Design an enzyme around this catalytic site. Structure first.
Site, PDB file in Angstrom:
ATOM      1  CG  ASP A 168      -0.174   7.201   3.339  1.00 48.02           C
ATOM      2  OD1 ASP A 168      -1.179   7.019   4.107  1.00 48.02           O
ATOM      3  OD2 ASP A 168      -0.340   7.230   2.076  1.00 48.02           O
ATOM      4  CE  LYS A 226      -0.304   3.919  -6.430  1.00 41.24           C
ATOM      5  NZ  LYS A 226      -0.421   4.344  -5.007  1.00 41.24           N
ATOM      6  CB  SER A 285      -3.486   8.744   1.855  1.00 44.11           C
ATOM      7  OG  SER A 285      -2.745   7.716   1.186  1.00 44.11           O
ATOM      8  CB  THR A 336      -2.001   7.252  -3.710  1.00 47.40           C
ATOM      9  OG1 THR A 336      -2.585   6.041  -4.171  1.00 47.40           O
ATOM     10  CG2 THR A 336      -1.245   7.826  -4.874  1.00 47.40           C
ATOM     11  N   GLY A 352      -6.683   8.557  -5.857  1.00 44.81           N
ATOM     12  CA  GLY A 352      -8.095   8.706  -5.526  1.00 44.81           C
ATOM     13  C   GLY A 352      -8.675   7.394  -5.959  1.00 44.81           C
ATOM     14  NE  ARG A 390       1.130  -0.444   0.601  1.00 43.70           N
ATOM     15  CZ  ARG A 390       1.547  -0.600   1.893  1.00 43.70           C
ATOM     16  NH1 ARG A 390       0.912  -0.020   2.899  1.00 43.70           N
ATOM     17  NH2 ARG A 390       2.604  -1.299   2.122  1.00 43.70           N
ATOM     18  CB  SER A 395       2.066   5.522   0.318  1.00 44.17           C
ATOM     19  OG  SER A 395       1.168   6.588   0.019  1.00 44.17           O
ATOM     20  CG  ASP A 407       2.511   4.867  -3.560  1.00 44.19           C
ATOM     21  OD1 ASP A 407       1.802   5.720  -4.174  1.00 44.19           O
ATOM     22  OD2 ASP A 407       1.997   3.941  -2.884  1.00 44.19           O
TER      23      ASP A 407
HETATM   24 CL   LIG Z   1      -4.761   8.451  -2.013  1.00 46.91          CL
END
Ligand SMILES: [Cl-]
Ligand SMILES: *[B]([O])([O])[C]([C][C]([C])[C])[N]C(=O)[C]([N]C(=O)C1=[C][C]=[C]C(C2=[C][C]=[C][C]=[C]2)=N1)[C]([C])[O]
Ligand SMILES: [Cl-]
Ligand SMILES: [Cl-]
Ligand SMILES: [Cl-]
Ligand SMILES: [Cl-]
Ligand SMILES: [Cl-]
Ligand SMILES: [Cl-]
Ligand SMILES: [Cl-]
Ligand SMILES: [Cl-]
Ligand SMILES: [Cl-]
Ligand SMILES: [Cl-]
Ligand SMILES: [Cl-]
Ligand SMILES: [Cl-]
Ligand SMILES: [Cl-]
Ligand SMILES: [Cl-]
Ligand SMILES: [Cl-]
Ligand SMILES: [Cl-]
Ligand SMILES: [Cl-]
Ligand SMILES: [Cl-]
Ligand SMILES: [K+]
Ligand SMILES: [K+]
Ligand SMILES: [K+]
Ligand SMILES: [Mg+2]
Ligand SMILES: [Mg+2]
Ligand SMILES: [Mg+2]
Lengths: 244, 220, 230, 234, 239, 204, 202, 248
Positions: free
Chosen positions: B166, B33, B129, B1, B47, B19, B169, B17
């Site tokens: 990342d 999100k 992340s 994320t 999270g 994903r 993500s 994002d």
């Molecule tokens: Cl995350």
């Protein structure tokens, strides 16, 4: 009906045959046991609470005789009616406010504090095991959008915001005085707010006060912190009134 | 994320994002999100997904109860306190990492909120992340008092950095723009990633699959 | 502790007199009216508003429960604020589980159940209110009444509070099923005019409406406008 | 009348009838006397026997090595209170390794027995005690009542016809502080004997005696063990 | 009938059960407090109901904290329970906030506890009124009085019990703001001897306590020699 | 791993005006097959089915507890539950056990009882919901299932083509998983009927 | 973190760095670690951000309510006592190294340390947090009895600057506050305004 | 507090329970409600009290409640009380289904509720529920069934009965017309309308004024239906035609 009674309807808060709550009605009578009257008025710039200060006994420390109470730094209150009941209600209001600020990050609005105290009093009108509190709370504070506010709640759990209001022995007479004076004012709004409050009180009691016989509390748009007038400050109003 | 937020001249831009992963597999390509808190307040979540969903829903619901009572537009600080006091009480077992932004009577406000209950009130934040990739973009490019479009460009660049750098993500960029006058929930804002096409067709005609048993139950 | 015995019991003729006396508090309350038009609902009420000293905007009788549901009452105001608070809470508990706004009828059932409790549970009296609950869901308007026993009813139009008997016959001779909401608002206010006394202003009545767009109070300026014709 | 059934109901005179009724339970118990010198605290009690073939009700109870009690009123209440006292004493020896001072134990009794006088549906304790003890401040006699009030006494008598015993004790109290033990117990017996019908006498069957002092742990004397004290009422 | 529960108002808005509790305090013998320049002095007319009782039995003067004395009238078991409540409150305050409880706060807290017993059928009001006195360099001398309804005020002089009014009228003659505790004890003893009805109740002990500059802010019994002199002064002044 | 103790696989898939849901049939305990007709897909409505893979005991508990709640829901309300509302009901049930969860990860497939619009979703074991417009998978061979569904699924498929796709996705996916299979069952849900088939499948 | 406070005649000076870390990522480079607890009472926070924020909000509530009730400004000693009670009672669940400082009319400027574990001690000046280790020798050599407000500010700014250079978990800007009867004056030293001491090159 | 306690759960001197009796008077004044068992089904027919013109009509019935797949009930007495009880019935039925994975047998559902009612007459100091119920159902142990329960917590099974207004009269008419072992749904429906025609003697019988539900078995499944007004009018018409024949 018309003053009918069955069973225990005068002893606990159950409905009488007309649908009345006699114990709640009797709590309004307890408000007048104290023999005092309070007035509150709001203008565009300030809100004011005025009450009688009666110190019959010379042996009292008169600095401890008050019915004006700070609830938060920005919310003041005048209490009318049974003293110990009133103190308890003031404590609860202080707790509600401080709790609200801790949970929500901003000061409790005066309307919400008055509503909460009124909702708590409501419970005493529906549950049989305790009596209502025989006191009435009038709250003043500045609302950022609505300006100065005056709110009152009573032992029935009713509450309302006002242009001006009163409590205690001369409540009706005060309400008449205040009603007649606002109809006269443009945009039905008080403007000389401390003077209106003291004059209202002075008329309905027929006294012409000394500065030690009343207490005066204020909040203003420029100075929202609740402030209690000193004797000298009250005297300056009394003198300025006397001279026109 | 990757989730992020910026305070611009007239408001807040939030970004995220789309994903969601289970292990190192993409479970959702188009997860939303950026969650509703109140009409003037939104909250990006990273999270544990059930935790972010349930936490934002609960606080939104309790705020609605609050505003119904007060009759007033809720405050960002109020959402922030409710979130953080609940997260503290659970000692970081509720794995919600949030970016909370909105506009109230006192103006725009943006907070990051961590699972253990700390919060930081700041003019730009990132979480998830991908948060360091997004933060690089902000440290390099953020200016105070951006105009709306510059702010939107900056947020979506920051989310793109997380998307591309990342592995946690990906997929789309969603934005939410909040001012005194306007709420623009822009889902998707950008679709920088697309499945390639299918070169060979596998249209399996009826009878390809052998059938042992069949029951047709007609309905009304 | 709390009294653990019921304060409502059956009389020798099978009546729950506390509930009947609660109904008398309702009958003595200020009038309320609800009309279900084809495309929405209007709720309207009189303020027992003395004084010019009242800030009429400071408390409302017509209240939102959700975006799509609103309430008004006749009877005791502070009792009503309890039920408003519980209704809001019930609506939110439903929304958390089902992620859909509570259907009007489901909200009425749960509120009515709370009112039933206060007719049996220990050491308490019934609520001295009747609620009128309006809502829109499944593409359609709803108007319900919930009384101090916890009984509820779906109405096309009704009146409660002072002079409700006459209010209902006034509506009986004036409501049609194909009626629009703008007309309904008009006839709701005429129904209050039947039992008013005072000269009506926008400051001493309150009006709420419910349609596809949601539930809301009319503003003083909007009420003023409807009061021109009346 | 409407004022006499609940301990929570004040009468219009500022009295609580239930508490006054509970005190009557003590006035109808058999008499007991307590007195002290500089060195000893003594209890003396008349035991009532139901029939001619019954033992005679215990009146004197051990509390701790330094404390004993004589009772008048509801025996079940007397045991409950006695058990409370015992536990308070064990607690203080457990915690502090020293005897619970007698005046503190009595305070605990006042605080404990007050509580049910103020709660609906509870009742006072229907027992009065004489408490004999010895600690760093010397010997003591305390009295406790169903009202939860208590008193520190030079000497005392409670129960039926105790007025007589009280008079006797006032008459001779200036002698008590200087008395040896035998003299002091004699005085207790003479006070108690005033409470009796003229016909009837102190016997080994109806007298119970409790003594504590500087060199003597609380000890109970019944039946044949009271005879030394009864011989030489001469 | 309207006077059987503290949870029932009468039709005139009274709570008779609190009034009845007040009558128990008004049946009691008299206690007085006087605040002066450098402290607060208490005196109690302590009726001795039997010659069999020790000197000091049934004290009506208590230490509720090291700096705070309490003087009571009314039902003595209720007063003692209140002295325990006050003690517990002073103790808890010190544990939580780390300093000696200010007198006014203590008075207000124990008053709210008294108040809580005036609302309910479940419990009865306390049959006692009490005064709280303290002194510190920072707060000066303070004397508060609480009654069975839970009302709490501050005073220059105060009296409770059955000769309350007679006592007040004597207290009003004093210019107590300018007097010291050493002067005031004599006047307290004098006043108790004036209001004592020697025909109707035969024997009494004078009980005296004080807290002021002279005790370094500790509430203490007036020493025996000073009490005896004050008695002798009071008695000869009666003449 | 708790989720692999029994093995198993479910998926669902959307077509034009129809949905499909499928499951393997094995009930086994680690290596050992115990039975080959174990039910994992349960009716929640005429046109609404829930498929549960994971620990068999929790598959059964969740289906039974869910049914309890749904039946009370339907009796109380006027009506048949909506697909999205079932999802939320299941989410709420699973999240109540957030700190001691049921080990199952359901998929739901059905048609709106009034509009007949297709719906599919899945949820993780603590109740996080995920709606999609194509397919969802859950079980010990999820990767295999993803590979088959991503390669074969196409939009707007008619009932016959949906049946062939879901069937080929399931069979070939479970044939790469030791602890799933021993048969496949497929329900096709249309407006006017349900079609239930068992597939010729490997039994090893 | 590095936190410090210093008593002067009439008031106190407080300071902190502004770095929040998670591992060695800086999650906020301009943290405000000096939190007002009442009009003239601040706490400097170190340790867990979540813990010290929750405790500070709680004590702010308690102190505010107490102060309204008494109708007087609260004592610095009271604020410290309330932190101590909560940090001691919950010492097993909290990571909080606190400095409480402020002004009240009864005792003037005061500094209290409530280190981890929940003891409380009044001091002339106090330092805490991970970076304090690197400035013990500096503060012990440089402290003088009787410093003015201005001297306290410079002493604080220097100490903090030194700690910040060495402690990887401290850095960013130096936030300072001075508290006296007249009120609270806050300022930030950033960039070139932070005191500077050469790296010792050959 | 002893003064205010009306003591709802104590015996009177004849061994009676006054509240229970008093609740039974409430029931006797409520809408008439009858149940009739047949060979191929069971029915409930109830007088409606919701009949004012301005009422809106939003549920599929006023006083007929579905309890589970195989069972329904009707009620006479305090409506809000009936809502609490019918909610509790649904919960018990789902608890049994959860535990056993089969429907609760009818009598067991009734008994479970009656034990709750019983408790309210024996302890807790509360007023009893002012409700009597008729229960219709099918189970695999006794097939089609009809039960009646009242505020005492007593229940029985019946082939035909009535509760609410004019009960005694309704039971007499049933005693005389009901054919044990020989009734059909179609003849029970005729008899129900006959009975309501007589016992609603204030005044002339209408489809707006009654509610009928039938419970039948079809293809191994229980079907529970509230008859539409078109059908109720048709049965009223047939009853009126039938009475024309009565003499010649
Ligand atoms: Cl995350
Ligand atoms: B200082 O003591 O170094 C500083 C003081 C603080 C701001 C009051 N403390 C920290 O930077 C500490 N950091 C955190 O507490 C923190 C902040 C944000 C998230 C997390 C986190 C905790 C657990 C798991 C994930 C993330 N911690 C630091 C020294 O630990
Ligand atoms: Cl706060
Ligand atoms: Cl004016
Ligand atoms: Cl905050
Ligand atoms: Cl009870
Ligand atoms: Cl609310
Ligand atoms: Cl909603
Ligand atoms: Cl609105
Ligand atoms: Cl005895
Ligand atoms: Cl006995
Ligand atoms: Cl006594
Ligand atoms: Cl006696
Ligand atoms: Cl008095
Ligand atoms: Cl469950
Ligand atoms: Cl530390
Ligand atoms: Cl530290
Ligand atoms: Cl930094
Ligand atoms: Cl079922
Ligand atoms: Cl079932
Ligand atoms: K009450
Ligand atoms: K921080
Ligand atoms: K550093
Ligand atoms: Mg922790
Ligand atoms: Mg396989
Ligand atoms: Mg094999």
């Amino acid at each position: 009906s018309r003053g009918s009674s069955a069973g225990f309807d005068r002893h606990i808060t159950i409905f009488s045959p007309e649908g009345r709550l006699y114990q709640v009605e009797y709590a309004f009578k307890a408000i007048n046991q104290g023999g005092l009257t309070s007035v509150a008025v709001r203008g565009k710039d300030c809100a004011v609470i005025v009450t009688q200060k009666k110190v019959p006994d010379k042996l009292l420390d008169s600095s401890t005789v008050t019915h004006l109470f700070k609830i938060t730094e920005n919310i003041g209150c005048v209490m009318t009616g049974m003293t110990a009941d009133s103190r308890s209600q003031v404590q609860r209001a202080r707790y509600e406010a401080a709790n609200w600020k801790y949970k929500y990050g901003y000061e409790i609005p005066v309307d919400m504090l008055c509503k909460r105290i009124a909702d708590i009093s409501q419970v005493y009108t529906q549950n049989a095991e305790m009596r209502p509190l025989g006191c009435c709370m009038i709250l003043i504070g500045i609302d950022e959008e609505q300006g100065p506010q005056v709110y009152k709640c009573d032992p029935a759990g009713y509450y309302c915001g006002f242009k001006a209001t009163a409590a205690g022995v001369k409540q009706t007479e005060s309400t008449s005085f205040l009603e007649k004076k606002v109809k006269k004012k443009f945009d039905w709004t008080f403007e000389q707010t401390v003077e209106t409050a003291i004059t209202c009180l002075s008329t309905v009691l027929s006294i012409d006060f000394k500065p030690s016989e009343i207490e005066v509390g204020v909040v203003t748009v420029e100075n929202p912190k609740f402030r209690i007038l000193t004797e000298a400050e009250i005297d300056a109003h009394l003198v300025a009134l006397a001279e026109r | 994320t990757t989730i992020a937020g910026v305070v611009y001249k007239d408001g807040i831009v939030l970004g995220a994002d789309t994903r969601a992963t289970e292990g190192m597999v993409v479970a959702d390509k188009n997860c939303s999100k950026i969650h509703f808190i109140s009409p003037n307040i939104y909250c990006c979540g990273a999270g544990t997904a059930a935790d972010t969903d349930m936490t934002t829903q609960l606080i939104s619901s309790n705020l609605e109860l609050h505003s119904l009572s007060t009759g007033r537009l809720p405050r960002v600080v109020t959402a922030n306190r409710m979130l953080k006091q609940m997260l503290f009480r659970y000692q970081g077992y509720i794995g919600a990492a949030l970016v909370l932004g909105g506009v109230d009577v006192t103006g725009p406000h943006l907070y990051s909120i961590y699972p253990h209950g700390s919060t930081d009130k700041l003019p730009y934040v990132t979480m998830g992340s991908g948060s360091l990739a997004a933060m690089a973009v902000f440290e390099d490019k953020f200016r105070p008092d951006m105009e709306e479009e510059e702010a939107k460009n900056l947020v979506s660049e920051a989310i793109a950095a997380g998307i591309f750098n990342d592995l946690g993500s990906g997929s789309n960029i969603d934005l939410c723009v909040i001012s005194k006058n306007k709420l623009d929930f822009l889902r998707p804002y950008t679709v920088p990633n697309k499945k390639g096409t299918r070169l060979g067709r596998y249209r399996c005609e009826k009878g390809t699959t052998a059938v042992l048993t069949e029951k047709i139950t007609p309905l009304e | 502790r709390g009294y653990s015995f019921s304060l409502t019991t059956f009389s020798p003729s099978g009546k729950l007199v506390q509930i009947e006396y609660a109904l008398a508090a309702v009958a003595g309350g200020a009038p309320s009216v609800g009309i279900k038009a084809a495309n929405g609902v209007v709720l309207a009420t009189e303020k027992k508003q003395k004084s010019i000293l009242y800030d009429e905007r400071s408390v409302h009788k017509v209240e939102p429960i959700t975006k799509h549901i609103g309430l008004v009452y006749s009877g005791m105001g502070p009792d009503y604020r309890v039920l408003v608070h519980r209704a809001r809470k019930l609506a939110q508990q439903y929304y958390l589980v089902y992620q859909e706004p509570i259907p009007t009828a489901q909200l009425v059932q749960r509120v009515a159940s709370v009112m039933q409790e206060y007719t049996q549970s220990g050491g308490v009296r019934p609520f001295g209110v009747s609620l009128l609950i309006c809502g829109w869901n499944e593409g359609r308007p709803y108007l319900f009444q919930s009384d101090p026993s916890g009984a509820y009813f779906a109405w096309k139009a009704t009146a409660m509070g002072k002079n409700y008997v006459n209010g209902k016959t006034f509506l009986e001779k004036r409501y049609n099923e194909d009626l629009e909401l703008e007309d309904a608002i008009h006839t709701a206010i005429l129904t209050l005019k039947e039992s008013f006394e005072g000269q009506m202003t926008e400051d001493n009545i309150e009006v709420g409406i419910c349609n596809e767009a949601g539930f809301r109070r009319l503003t003083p300026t909007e009420v003023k406008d409807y009061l021109a014709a009346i | 009348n409407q004022y006499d059934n609940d301990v929570t109901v004040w009468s219009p005179q500022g009295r609580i009838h239930q508490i006054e009724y509970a005190m009557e339970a003590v006035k109808q118990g058999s008499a007991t006397v307590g007195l002290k010198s500089k060195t000893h605290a003594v209890l003396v009690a008349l035991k009532r026997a139901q029939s001619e073939l019954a033992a005679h009700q215990k009146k004197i109870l051990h509390v701790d090595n330094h404390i004993g009690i004589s009772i008048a009123g509801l025996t079940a209440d007397a045991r409950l209170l006695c058990n409370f006292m015992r536990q308070e004493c064990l607690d203080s020896r457990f915690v502090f390794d020293r005897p619970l001072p007698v005046s503190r134990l009595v305070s605990l009794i006042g605080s404990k027995t007050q509580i049910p006088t103020q709660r609906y549906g509870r009742r006072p304790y229907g027992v009065g005690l004489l408490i004999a003890g010895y600690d760093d401040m010397g010997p003591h006699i305390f009295q406790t009542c169903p009202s939860a009030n208590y008193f520190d006494c030079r000497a005392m008598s409670i129960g039926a016809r105790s007025q007589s015993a009280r008079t006797y004790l006032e008459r001779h109290m200036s002698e008590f502080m200087e008395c040896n033990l035998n003299e002091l117990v004699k005085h207790g017996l003479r006070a108690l004997r005033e409470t009796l019908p003229a016909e009837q006498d102190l016997t080994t069957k109806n007298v119970s005696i409790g003594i504590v002092g500087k060199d003597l742990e609380f000890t109970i004397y019944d039946d044949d063990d009271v005879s030394p004290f009864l011989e030489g009422l001469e | 009938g309207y006077d059987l529960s503290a949870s029932t108002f009468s039709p005139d808005g009274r709570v008779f059960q609190v009034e009845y509790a007040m009558k128990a305090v008004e049946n009691s013998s008299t206690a007085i407090g006087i605040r002066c320049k450098d402290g607060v002095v208490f005196g109690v007319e302590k009726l001795v109901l039997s010659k069999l009782y020790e000197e000091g039995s049934n004290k009506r003067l208590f230490n509720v904290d090291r700096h705070v004395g309490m003087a009571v009238a009314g039902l003595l078991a209720d007063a003692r329970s209140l002295a325990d409540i006050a003690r517990e409150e002073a103790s808890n305050f010190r544990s939580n906030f780390g300093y000696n409880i200010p007198l006014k706060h203590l008075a207000d807290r124990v008053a709210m506890y008294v108040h809580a017993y005036t609302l309910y059928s479940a419990v009865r009001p306390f049959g006692c009124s009490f005064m709280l006195g303290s002194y510190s360099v920072n707060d000066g001398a303070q004397l508060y009085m609480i009654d069975p309804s839970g009302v709490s005020y501050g005073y220059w002089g105060c009296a409770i019990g059955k000769a309350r009014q007679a006592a007040k009228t004597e207290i009003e003659k004093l210019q107590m703001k300018e007097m010291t505790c050493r002067d005031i004890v004599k006047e307290v003893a004098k006043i108790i001897y004036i209001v004592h009805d020697e025909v109707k109740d035969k024997a009494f002990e004078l009980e005296l306590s004080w807290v002021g500059e002279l005790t370094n802010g500790r509430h203490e019994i007036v020493p025996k020699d000073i009490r005896e002199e004050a008695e002798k002064y009071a008695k000869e002044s009666l003449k | 791993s708790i989720m692999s103790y029994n093995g198993g696989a479910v998926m669902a898939m959307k077509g034009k005006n129809c949905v499909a849901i499928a499951a393997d049939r094995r009930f086994g305990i680690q290596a050992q097959m115990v039975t080959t007709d174990f039910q994992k897909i349960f009716p929640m409505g005429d046109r609404l089915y829930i498929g549960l893979a994971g620990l068999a005991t929790d598959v059964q508990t969740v289906a039974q507890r869910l049914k309890f709640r749904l039946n009370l829901y339907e009796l109380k309300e006027g009506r048949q539950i909506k697909p999205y509302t079932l999802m939320s009901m299941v989410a709420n049930l699973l999240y109540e056990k957030r700190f001691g969860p049921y080990y199952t990860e359901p998929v739901i497939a059905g048609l709106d009882p009034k509009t007949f619009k297709p719906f599919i979703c899945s949820l993780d074991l603590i109740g996080c919901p995920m709606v999609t417009d194509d397919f969802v998978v859950s079980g010990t061979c999820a990767e295999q299932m993803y590979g088959m569904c991503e390669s074969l699924w196409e939009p707007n498929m008619d009932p016959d083509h949906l049946f062939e796709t879901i069937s080929q996705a399931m069979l070939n996916a479970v044939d790469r998983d030791a602890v799933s299979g021993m048969g496949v069952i497929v329900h096709i849900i249309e407006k006017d009927k349900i079609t239930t088939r068992t597939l010729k499948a490997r039994m090893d | 973190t590095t936190i410090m406070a210093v008593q002067f005649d009439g008031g106190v000076v407080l300071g902190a760095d502004s770095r929040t870390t998670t591992g060695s990522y800086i999650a906020n480079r301009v943290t405000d670690k000096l939190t007002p607890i009442h009009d003239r009472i601040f706490c400097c926070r170190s340790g867990s951000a979540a813990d010290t924020q929750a405790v500070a909000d709680a004590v702010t509530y308690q102190l505010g309510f107490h102060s309204i009730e008494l109708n007087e400004p609260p004592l610095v000693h009271t604020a410290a006592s309330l932190f101590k009670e909560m940090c001691y009672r919950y010492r097993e669940d909290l990571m909080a190294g606190i400095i409480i400082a402020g002004w009240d009319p009864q005792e003037g400027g005061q500094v209290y340390s409530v280190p981890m574990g929940g003891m409380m001690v009044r001091q002339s000046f106090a330092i805490g947090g991970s970076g304090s280790s690197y400035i013990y020798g500096y503060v012990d050599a440089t402290y003088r009895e009787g410093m003015t407000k201005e001297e306290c500010l410079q002493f604080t700014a220097n100490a903090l600057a030194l700690a910040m250079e060495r402690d990887g978990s401290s850095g960013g800007v130096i936030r300072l506050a001075a508290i006296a009867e007249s009120g609270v004056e806050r300022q930030v030293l950033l960039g070139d305004q932070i005191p500077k001491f050469a790296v010792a090159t050959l | 507090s002893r003064r205010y306690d009306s003591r709802t759960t104590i015996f009177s001197p004849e061994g009676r329970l006054y509240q229970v009796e008093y609740a039974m008077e409430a029931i006797g004044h409520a809408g008439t409600c009858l149940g009739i068992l047949a060979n191929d089904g069971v029915l409930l027919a109830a007088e409606r009290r919701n009949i004012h013109k301005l009422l809106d009509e939003v549920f599929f019935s006023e006083k007929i409640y579905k309890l589970n797949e195989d069972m329904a009930c009707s009620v006479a007495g305090i409506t809000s009380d009936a809502n609490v009880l019918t909610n509790e019935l649904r919960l018990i039925a789902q608890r049994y289904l959860l535990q056993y994975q089969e429907p609760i047998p009818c009598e067991q559902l009734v008994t479970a509720l009656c034990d709750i009612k019983q408790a309210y007459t024996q302890f807790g100091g509360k007023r009893p529920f002012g409700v009597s119920l008729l229960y219709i159902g099918w189970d695999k142990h006794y097939g089609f069934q009809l039960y009646q329960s009242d505020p005492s917590g007593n229940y029985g099974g019946w082939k035909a009965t009535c509760i609410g207004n004019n009960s005694a009269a309704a039971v007499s008419m049933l005693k005389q017309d009901y054919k044990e072992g020989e009734m059909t749904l179609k003849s029970a429906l005729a008899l129900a309308i006959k009975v309501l025609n007589k016992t609603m003697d204030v005044s002339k019988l209408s489809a707006e004024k009654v509610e009928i539900a039938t419970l039948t078995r079809e293809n191994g499944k229980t079907v529970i239906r509230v008859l539409k007004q078109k059908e109720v009018e048709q049965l009223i018409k047939k009853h009126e035609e039938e009475e024309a024949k009565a003499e010649r």
